[PDB]
Amino acid sequence: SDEEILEKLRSIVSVGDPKKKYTRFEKIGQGASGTVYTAMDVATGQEVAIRQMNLQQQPKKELIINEILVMRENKNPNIVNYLDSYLVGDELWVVMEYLAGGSLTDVVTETCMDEGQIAAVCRECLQALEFLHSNQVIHRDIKSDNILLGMDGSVKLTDFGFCAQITPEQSKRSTMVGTPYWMAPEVVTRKAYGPKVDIWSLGIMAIEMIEGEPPYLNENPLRALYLIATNGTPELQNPEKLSAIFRDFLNRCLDMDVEKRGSAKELLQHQFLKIAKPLSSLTPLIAAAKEAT
Numbered sequence: 001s002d003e004e005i006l007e008k009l010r011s012i013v014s015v016g017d018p019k020k021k022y023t024r025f026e027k028i029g030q031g032a033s034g035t036v037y038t039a040m041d042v043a044t045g046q047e048v049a050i051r052q053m054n055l056q057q058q059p060k061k062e063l064i065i066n067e068i069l070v071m072r073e074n075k076n077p078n079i080v081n082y083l084d085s086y087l088v089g090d091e092l093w094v095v096m097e098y099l100a101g102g103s104l105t106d107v108v109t110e111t112c113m114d115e116g117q118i119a120a121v122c123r124e125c126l127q128a129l130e131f132l133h134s135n136q137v138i139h140r141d142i143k144s145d146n147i148l149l150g151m152d153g154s155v156k157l158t159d160f161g162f163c164a165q166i167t168p169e170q171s172k173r174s175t176m177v178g179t180p181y182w183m184a185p186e187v188v189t190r191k192a193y194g195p196k197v198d199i200w201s202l203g204i205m206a207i208e209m210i211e212g213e214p215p216y217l218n219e220n221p222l223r224a225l226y227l228i229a230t231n232g233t234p235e236l237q238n239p240e241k242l243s244a245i246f247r248d249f250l251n252r253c254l255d256m257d258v259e260k261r262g263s264a265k266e267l268l269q270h271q272f273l274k275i276a277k278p279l280s281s282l283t284p285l286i287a288a289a290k291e292a293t
Contacts, residue, residue: 005061018086049098055090067160078128080158101149106289108208116277118209123273124155130264133195138164142201143182153279180221181214189229196261203253232256245272
């Protein structure tokens with residue numbers, strides 16, 4: 001009930017209006033997710049990203065509550081920090097840290113990453129995934145768009161608007177919520193999938209870093225899903241150009257047999273990650289992609 005949902009949010013949020021705690025607001029995005037502003041914590045100085053939503057015009061408010069509760073209880077260096085929330089009437093404000101380096105999508109579409117840089121990003125993403133999976137959380141919408149970058153090269157996962165919490169019981173999910181092109185075959189074929197759907201998505205993200213886009217991007221989303229389910233593991237355009245260890249890493253992320261696919265815990269030990277360059281090696285690419293926009 002809209003009423004109960006408001007009381008629930010009321011219990012979660014900090015009290016009052018945010019207009020005192022933040023200053024130089026600047027409007028960025030303005031989709032259906034709400035209006036997003038950059039702003040400055042007046043008390044810490046930290047630049048933040050604030051999403052403002054009008055509840056009565058927000059469809060699935062349970063997902064928003066789930067997102068806040070999950071973020072609040074699963075803080076991690078490789079997850080964009082959830083800072084606070086406020087409710088003013090039917091207006092809900094969610095405050096996140098702001099990363100000035102844009103997203104991984106900007107980097108893979110505007111620059112050419114080398115294997116050392118790719119290994120670094122893959123490692124940081126696997127750190128977030130191992131942590132989440134160890135805490136029974138499946139992100140379910142892993143893709144470059146949801147990987148934000150700091151100017152120093154920090155790599156953080158965001159958007160828990162589609163995550164799932166599992167248990168011994170209800171250890172598997174069925175709900176098709178992720179973005180088509182990055183979805184694991186088992187999500188579309190068969191039912192009941194587990195945490196490894198995020199591992200498959202990470203492999204597709206690695207293809208993005210190599211080729212600039214996930215396989216089948218050119219296709220209608222409806223057709224990509226059928227292809228993903230009927231073609232299985234994607235084929236690289238120029239596999240010979242990659243090192244044997246990177247090809248092995250991709251093969252482990254994109255195996256069809258879920259049992260055979262690597263878990264986050266297993267892949268964190270992969271030798272491909274050991275060739276990672278320092279995270280600051282990403283700064284030049286992030287700068288180039290930001291100006292190119």
